[PDB]
Amino acid sequence: KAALCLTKRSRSRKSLARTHGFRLRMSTTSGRALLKRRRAKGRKILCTKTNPSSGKRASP
Amino acid sequence: QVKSNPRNNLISGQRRCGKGRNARGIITARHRGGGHKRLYRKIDFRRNEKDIYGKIVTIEYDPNRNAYICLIHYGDGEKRYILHPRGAIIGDTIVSGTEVPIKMGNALPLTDMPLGTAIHNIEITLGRGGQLARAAGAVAKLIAKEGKSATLKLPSGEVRLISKNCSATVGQVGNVGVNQKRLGRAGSKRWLGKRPVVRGVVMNPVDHPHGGGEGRAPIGRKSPTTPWGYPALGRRSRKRNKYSDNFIIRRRS
Amino acid sequence: SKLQLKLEQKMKMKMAKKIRLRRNRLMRKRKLRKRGAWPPSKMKKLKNV
Amino acid sequence: KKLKYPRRILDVYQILQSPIITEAAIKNIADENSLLFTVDVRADKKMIREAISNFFGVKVRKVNTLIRPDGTKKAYIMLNKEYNASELAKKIGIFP
RNA sequence: GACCAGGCCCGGGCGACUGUUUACCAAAAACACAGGUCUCCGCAAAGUCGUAAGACCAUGUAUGGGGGCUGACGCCUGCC
RNA sequence: CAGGGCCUAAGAUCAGGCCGAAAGGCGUAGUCGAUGGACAACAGGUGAAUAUUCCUGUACUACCCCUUGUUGGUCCCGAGGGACGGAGGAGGCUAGGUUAGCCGAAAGAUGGUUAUCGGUUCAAGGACGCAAGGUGACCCUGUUUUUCAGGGUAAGAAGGGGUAGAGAAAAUGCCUCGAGCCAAUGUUCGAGUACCAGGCGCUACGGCGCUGAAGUAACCGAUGCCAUACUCCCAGGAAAAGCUCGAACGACCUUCAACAAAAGGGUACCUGUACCCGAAACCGACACAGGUAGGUAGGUAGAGAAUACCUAGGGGCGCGA
RNA sequence: GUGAAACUAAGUGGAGGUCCGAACCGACUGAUGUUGAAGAAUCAGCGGAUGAGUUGUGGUUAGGGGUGAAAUGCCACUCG
Ligand SMILES: [Mg+2]
Ligand SMILES: [Mg+2]
Ligand SMILES: [Mg+2]
Ligand SMILES: [Mg+2]
Ligand SMILES: [Mg+2]
Ligand SMILES: [Mg+2]
Ligand SMILES: [Mg+2]
Ligand SMILES: [Mg+2]
Ligand SMILES: [Mg+2]
Ligand SMILES: [Mg+2]
Ligand SMILES: [Mg+2]
Ligand SMILES: [Mg+2]
Ligand SMILES: [Mg+2]
Ligand SMILES: [Mg+2]
Ligand SMILES: [Mg+2]
Ligand SMILES: [Mg+2]
Ligand SMILES: [Mg+2]
Ligand SMILES: [Mg+2]
Ligand SMILES: [Mg+2]
Ligand SMILES: [Mg+2]
Ligand SMILES: [Mg+2]
Ligand SMILES: [Mg+2]
Ligand SMILES: [Mg+2]
Ligand SMILES: [Mg+2]
Ligand SMILES: [Mg+2]
Ligand SMILES: [Mg+2]
Ligand SMILES: [Mg+2]
Ligand SMILES: [Mg+2]
Ligand SMILES: [Mg+2]
Ligand SMILES: [Mg+2]
Ligand SMILES: [Mg+2]
Ligand SMILES: [Mg+2]
Ligand SMILES: [Mg+2]
Ligand SMILES: [Mg+2]
Ligand SMILES: [Mg+2]
Ligand SMILES: [Mg+2]
Ligand SMILES: [Mg+2]
Ligand SMILES: [Mg+2]
Ligand SMILES: [Mg+2]
Ligand SMILES: [Mg+2]
Ligand SMILES: [Mg+2]
Ligand SMILES: [Mg+2]
Ligand SMILES: [Mg+2]
Ligand SMILES: [Mg+2]
Ligand SMILES: [Mg+2]
Ligand SMILES: [Mg+2]
Ligand SMILES: [Mg+2]
Ligand SMILES: [Mg+2]
Ligand SMILES: [Mg+2]
Ligand SMILES: [Mg+2]
Ligand SMILES: [Mg+2]
Ligand SMILES: [Mg+2]
Ligand SMILES: [Mg+2]
Ligand SMILES: [Mg+2]
Ligand SMILES: [Mg+2]
Ligand SMILES: [Mg+2]
Ligand SMILES: [Mg+2]
Ligand SMILES: [Mg+2]
Ligand SMILES: [Mg+2]
Ligand SMILES: [Mg+2]
Ligand SMILES: [Mg+2]
Ligand SMILES: [Mg+2]
Ligand SMILES: [Mg+2]
Ligand SMILES: [Mg+2]
Ligand SMILES: [Mg+2]
Ligand SMILES: [Mg+2]
Ligand SMILES: [Mg+2]
Ligand SMILES: [Mg+2]
Ligand SMILES: [Mg+2]
Ligand SMILES: [Mg+2]
Ligand SMILES: [Mg+2]
Ligand SMILES: [Mg+2]
Ligand SMILES: [Mg+2]
Ligand SMILES: [Mg+2]
Ligand SMILES: [Mg+2]
Ligand SMILES: [Mg+2]
Ligand SMILES: [Mg+2]
Ligand SMILES: [Mg+2]
Ligand SMILES: [Mg+2]
C-alpha cells in the first residue's frame, strides 16, 4: 500500500549497525580493504551506520 | 488409538530448521517450507537393550512418519518409543534378544527367524539401527538363508542379501490405511509443508528445458528432461559399481 | 494421630496456596505491563476513551 | 573475598567537578536538602557517595545521577535530614 | 420515513472449486490445486549445491524421497 | 518501569578438528543473539520544562547484620519442574455504564415548571475467606441424564506417605492414608483531618489562600479475568536458566567457619527517561490530500469497533476579499 | 426396524480453504488528476475477510547467482 520510493523505512539502528557497523567491516578481509580505502580518501566518518552499545544513541 | 499424553523425555524441540536449505542456505530440496511446527520423537530403532520385558502402555501419533508409535515401559522404568506393529493392542508385551518366542513386536537376529516370516524395521549393518521397511504398511518377507547371508524381499519387491546377524522385528508396520486418505484440498497439502510445484512446460527457456513455445508447448526436446538437463524417463541412476552390488539379486519390477 | 497429619498438611497447603496465588497476581501484573494498560491510575483516565 | 575493585579506575579528586548554581538547583536545596553537582561521566554512584561522605563529612541518604544531552553527568545528592543542606550551602559558597 | 442497506431472470463459451499472478498500462480462459499416470531411487538412496571437506534430502526408508506430463467428479483413452 | 549485571530460539561466530592457489570453506564444545522464559511499587501531592524516578503515606525484592538451632556445606553430576496448538460454546465474575437513593446548589427576563444542574472517588499490598461456579470413579432407584435424594463399594480426586529391583532422588511395580479440592472475585485492613460539589475571601483580575456536605443501592454487562477450565479436531502444537528434589564420582572450602529458619534493624549496580510519535519533528526531496507495529474503547439509536448525532479531549485545514 | 443390522423424523452438537459484513489485506470498473495535492494518488462504487490468512520484531538465501502458486516476475523509483 506504500509507494515504491519508500525503500528506506524506520528500521532499528541496532539492526543496521549489525550490517553496516564497524565491527562487521572489521571481520571480513573485503571489509578491511573497505576501511583502508575510506581512510585513504580521508573520510571524517568511517562507518556511517554504527551504534553505541549503550549510551545516548543506544538501541535496547 | 490417538489420545495425547503429556511429554515424556523422548519428545524434544531440537531440529534442523530451514527445510530444504543446505549450508550455503540455498534451496537444494525443492517444495518444502510452510507447515505445522513438529516435535521430534526419539524412536528406538536399535531395540538394542536385550532380555528385559517391555509392555505397551499406549499408542501415539507422530508427525514425522506415517506409521504410528508406541510408548512402552519396562520393569526398569526406562521408556522407549517403538514403531507400532500391525495388530498390536495396548497391554501387549514385547521383548528382544536371541532366543525368543516369535510373535508381533519381538525383535531378533535373522539367524533365529523361521523362513517365510514377515518382518519390518530391518538393520542392514550390525548395531547401526533398523533401516529398511519402517513406513506405514511396509513389510519384508524372509525368503531363504544360506552361509553368512540372509535373503529378503523388500517392500519394493527387490530381493536382496543382508547379514545373518542383523536384527529385525516380527510383524508388519501398523496404520495400514494411511494412503487411503484423500486430501481433498490444496490447503491440506500445505499443512504438511509441501509447497506448490510448477510444471516445466510452463516456465521460460532460461528456467527450464521445456521452455515456452508460443501458445502451449509440446515438449520439443526429443526427450523429457529434468530441470537440470538429463533424460527424465527410464535412465538408471544407480551408481554402476557400488559395493552393494554383490548383495543385490533381483531388481524391483 | 490423624489430626497431626491433617494440621501439618493444612500448614503445607496454606503455604503452597499462598505462594501460588502471590505468583499469579505477579504474572498478571506483568502481562498488563507488557500490553501497557498498567498503572491503574492510567486506565482510569482513559476509561471513557 | 578479594580487594573491592571500584567499578572503574578513576581518581576521586577529579570526579566532583562543580556545584551547579542556577534558580532551579537552589530550591532543590530548600525543599529536598539536595545538592547539585556536575561530575565526571565515567563516575558512578558508589564513588560519589564515598567522595562526598568523606570530603564534606556528611552522611548521604541517596544519590541520583543524570546524563545531559551534552554528555556531562549531573548528580542530585540528597543528604540525611539530620544534616541541613543550607549548612553546606554556606560552607561552600552557594547562597540561598 | 435520515444515515446505513442485494437489482433479478433466461441462455451459451472457458476454467471444476477458495486461492496466485505481470510493484507503476494485462487479473484472465494464464499459474496453482485435490486426483490421475509414467519413470528413477535398497539407504555409504536417487536428486541438488560445493574445487574439495561436507551440507541438504532426512535425524526420513518404497503406504517414503526425486523428476516428467495431465489436471475435481462422470464416460473413456483408439491405431503406428 | 525498559534493556545490561540472568537463559536460551532462528541465526551468527567458532578453540582445538576436516578440507582449500591465497583470501578462506565446513564444523564440535564454547561464546554471542529477544521479537520469547526468569525477576520486586502503588495512591495522592508538587510541577516554566521531569516523575511508577522528587516529596508523604503504606508496600515489596536481593543481600548484610545480629540472636537461636544444627554440624559438614559448595560446585560437578542424577532427576522433577519450567513447557507451551487450533476451533467451539457454556458458565462464574469484574471493568465499565445506566437508573434510583443521599447531598449541595438552582430561577437561567417566554405559556407552564423544579420534572433542573452539579457531586456520589479511591491503588499496589497484607490478612481472612469460596457457592447458585468448576472438578472429585462406579452400581441400583427416581428428578429430562443434569442441579439433586438414600444406600453401597474401599483409593475412588487434589494431595501426601511407605516399600521393591544394580535403584539416593526420579521413573516403574505392589501397599497405604486422605473427601475434599480449584481460582477469578468477595469481606476486612490499607483509607482518612486523603480526594471532592460547592462556601469564603484576595485579585498582578493569570492564579491564589481559607473551611468542606453525602460518599450507598438496583438493573444492564464485556472482545477483559478464572483459563493451558472444559469439549472437540488433526495439521499434533520451542529451548535453556532461575526454581524443587538428591546418593555414589570429581574438585574446592572448613569453625564460631558454613548452611537452616521466624522475627528485628540496616544496605541499594550501570544505560534509557526532554519533545514528536493516525506525525509540520519518523518514512515520502516540501510545513507534501500518502505510508507507519502496539495499548485504552463513554452516551443515544443500532446486530455492531458499521453508520448518524454527541461527551472527554482536541481542532477550524498559513492567502484573502 | 429386525434376532443380528439397515432405514427414518427428532433433539443435542458446532464442522467448513461455508455465507453476509467492519478492522485488516487487496486492486475490478468509472470519473478526476497529467508543468499532479501525489514519480501511481483521491473520489464513488468493488474482491478476500478462520485461512493456501494478515502483520510486528530478529534473522536467512547475492548476480556464470538468489527467489519465483511462472508474469521474464522480484532482488533499495535500476532487472532478458
Ligand atoms: Mg547518510
Ligand atoms: Mg515438549
Ligand atoms: Mg517435562
Ligand atoms: Mg551462511
Ligand atoms: Mg503443477
Ligand atoms: Mg509463460
Ligand atoms: Mg533469473
Ligand atoms: Mg533456480
Ligand atoms: Mg536451454
Ligand atoms: Mg518447447
Ligand atoms: Mg500453437
Ligand atoms: Mg469511543
Ligand atoms: Mg527538580
Ligand atoms: Mg538513571
Ligand atoms: Mg456462464
Ligand atoms: Mg461462440
Ligand atoms: Mg478459475
Ligand atoms: Mg505474493
Ligand atoms: Mg500491472
Ligand atoms: Mg480476478
Ligand atoms: Mg489492473
Ligand atoms: Mg500466472
Ligand atoms: Mg501432483
Ligand atoms: Mg548421494
Ligand atoms: Mg494444462
Ligand atoms: Mg543454534
Ligand atoms: Mg566461518
Ligand atoms: Mg581453526
Ligand atoms: Mg556450536
Ligand atoms: Mg545476551
Ligand atoms: Mg523482550
Ligand atoms: Mg533485571
Ligand atoms: Mg522488571
Ligand atoms: Mg510533559
Ligand atoms: Mg504519581
Ligand atoms: Mg494515603
Ligand atoms: Mg524479601
Ligand atoms: Mg539440570
Ligand atoms: Mg511460550
Ligand atoms: Mg463469558
Ligand atoms: Mg460499578
Ligand atoms: Mg434520568
Ligand atoms: Mg426524591
Ligand atoms: Mg421560561
Ligand atoms: Mg443527578
Ligand atoms: Mg485488596
Ligand atoms: Mg506479612
Ligand atoms: Mg459447591
Ligand atoms: Mg529410590
Ligand atoms: Mg534404598
Ligand atoms: Mg514413586
Ligand atoms: Mg446478568
Ligand atoms: Mg474475535
Ligand atoms: Mg487444549
Ligand atoms: Mg564425594
Ligand atoms: Mg538445604
Ligand atoms: Mg520521562
Ligand atoms: Mg515522557
Ligand atoms: Mg498522515
Ligand atoms: Mg500547511
Ligand atoms: Mg500531510
Ligand atoms: Mg458506542
Ligand atoms: Mg440498521
Ligand atoms: Mg443498546
Ligand atoms: Mg465512525
Ligand atoms: Mg468540545
Ligand atoms: Mg470464508
Ligand atoms: Mg465468496
Ligand atoms: Mg499483488
Ligand atoms: Mg477505494
Ligand atoms: Mg469491502
Ligand atoms: Mg465478505
Ligand atoms: Mg475453521
Ligand atoms: Mg509486507
Ligand atoms: Mg509470489
Ligand atoms: Mg513472454
Ligand atoms: Mg541505490
Ligand atoms: Mg525495482
Ligand atoms: Mg521489467
UniProtKB/Swiss-Prot annotation, chain A:
Where can this protein be found? Plastid, Chloroplast
Membrane-crossing ranges are none
Q: Which domain of life is it from?
A: Eukaryota
- Disulfide pairs here are none
Q: How does it assemble?
A: Component of the chloroplast large ribosomal subunit (LSU). Mature 70S chloroplast ribosomes of higher plants consist of a small (30S) and a large (50S) subunit. The 30S small subunit contains 1 molecule of ribosomal RNA (16S rRNA) and 24 different proteins. The 50S large subunit contains 3 rRNA molecules (23S, 5S and 4.5S rRNA) and 33 different proteins.
Q: Which family does it belong to?
A: Belongs to the bacterial ribosomal protein bL34 family.
The record's function comment reads: Component of the chloroplast ribosome (chloro-ribosome), a dedicated translation machinery responsible for the synthesis of chloroplast genome-encoded proteins, including proteins of the transcription and translation machinery and components of the photosynthetic apparatus.
Protein name, as recorded:
Large ribosomal subunit protein bL34c
> From which source organism is this entry?
Spinacia oleracea (Spinach)
The gene name on file is RPL34
Curated annotation (Swiss-Prot), chain B:
- Reply yes or no: does the keyword rRNA processing apply: no
Region entry Disordered: which residue ranges? 202-253
Q: What is its main location?
A: plastid
Sorted keywords for this record are: Chloroplast, Methylation, Plastid, Ribonucleoprotein, Ribosomal protein
Q: Name the SUPFAM superfamilies for this protein.
A: Nucleic acid-binding proteins, Translation proteins SH3-like domain
Its localization reads: Plastid, Chloroplast
Give the UniProt entry's GO cellular component terms.
chloroplast; mitochondrial large ribosomal subunit
Any one Gene Ontology molecular-function term assigned to this protein's record = rRNA binding
Q: Name one GO biological process term.
A: mitochondrial translation
| Family membership | Belongs to the universal ribosomal protein uL2 family.
The role this protein plays is: Component of the chloroplast ribosome (chloro-ribosome), a dedicated translation machinery responsible for the synthesis of chloroplast genome-encoded proteins, including proteins of the transcription and translation machinery and components of the photosynthetic apparatus.
Query: What is said about its interaction partners and assembly?
Result: Component of the chloroplast large ribosomal subunit (LSU). Mature 70S chloroplast ribosomes of higher plants consist of a small (30S) and a large (50S) subunit. The 30S small subunit contains 1 molecule of ribosomal RNA (16S rRNA) and 24 different proteins. The 50S large subunit contains 3 rRNA molecules (23S, 5S and 4.5S rRNA) and 33 different proteins.
Entry protein name: Large ribosomal subunit protein uL2cz/uL2cy
**Which species does this protein come from?**
Spinacia oleracea (Spinach)
Q: Which gene encodes it?
A: rpl2-A
Swiss-Prot record, chain C:
Domain of life where this protein originates: Eukaryota
Q: Where is this region: Disordered?
A: 30-49
Q: What is this protein called?
A: Large ribosomal subunit protein cL37 gamma
From Swiss-Prot, chain D:
Disulfide connectivity for this sequence is none
Location in or out of the cell: Plastid, Chloroplast
The similarity annotation says: Belongs to the universal ribosomal protein uL23 family.
Summary of subunit composition and partner proteins: Component of the chloroplast large ribosomal subunit (LSU). Mature 70S chloroplast ribosomes of higher plants consist of a small (30S) and a large (50S) subunit. The 30S small subunit contains 1 molecule of ribosomal RNA (16S rRNA) and 24 different proteins. The 50S large subunit contains 3 rRNA molecules (23S, 5S and 4.5S rRNA) and 33 different proteins.
What is noted besides the main data?
Answer: Two forms of the protein exist; they have the same N-terminal sequence and approximately the same molecular weight.
Q: What does this protein do?
A: Component of the chloroplast ribosome (chloro-ribosome), a dedicated translation machinery responsible for the synthesis of chloroplast genome-encoded proteins, including proteins of the transcription and translation machinery and components of the photosynthetic apparatus.
Report the protein name in the record. Answer: Large ribosomal subunit protein uL23c
Q: Which gene encodes it?
A: RPL23
